[PDB]
Amino acid sequence: STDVAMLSWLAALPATLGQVKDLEITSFKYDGQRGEVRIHARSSDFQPFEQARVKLAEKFNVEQGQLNRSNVVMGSFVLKRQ
Amino acid sequence: STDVAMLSWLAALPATLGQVKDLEITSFKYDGQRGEVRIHARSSDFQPFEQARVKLAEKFNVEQGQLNRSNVVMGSFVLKRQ
User: Fold this and answer.
1) Can you tell which superkingdom this protein's organism belongs to (chains A, B) (predicted)?
2) DSSP 3-state of A3
């Protein structure tokens, strides 16, 4: 019905993404029915995405989306529990 | 460009909405460009929405959306800074 564990742990994401230099979160969505969080972010380079994926992977199932350069690099992440 | 203060304070929303009995968060979205958070939730009654609005209003600019009954009551909130 609705994923409360992801809702709780989502509270750690601002502080976590906050540790990554040159990573701007432009949006993020929690979907309780799927228990996922999807995050869009941008940087001046790819390397902040690598740092973010590795950090998110410690406590989440992370999938990185495509990274595209516009001089901004744009990408996304899908998080699920684990 | 991107609203970091809302990103930070968004971390308090799960714990806050969590205090409200019979309020299920089905989704929520942060938009950094607008610096808003939009939340959809459901309950068995209207009263949890009242409790949630009042609590959110302490630290956010809150607008409650329409509440509609399906036996589930469905509504939403838009939060901005203040």
Assistant:
1) Bacteria
2) coil
Contact flag B7-A25 (C-beta cutoff 8 Å): yes
- Residue A7's domain comprises 1-82
Nearest by CB to A29, which of B7, B24, B29? B29
Q: Which residues of A touch B15 (CB under 8 A)?
A: 11
Tell me how close the Cα of B79 comes to any Cα of chain A, in angstroms: 14
Chain position carrying tokens 């309950």: B43
> Does an H or E element contain B2, and which?
none
Q: Residues of A with CB below 8 A from B18's CB?
A: 7-8
Long-range interactions of A70-76: CB distance < 8 A, separation 24+: A71/A44, A72/A42, A72/A43, A72/A44, A73/A42, A73/A43, A73/A44, A73/A45, A73/A46, A73/A49, A74/A40, A74/A41, A74/A42, A75/A40, A75/A41, A75/A42, A75/A49, A76/A38, A76/A39, A76/A40, A76/A41
Overall domain count for chain A: 1
Vertex B31 angle, CA B61 and A80, to 5°:
115
Resolution (A): 2.3
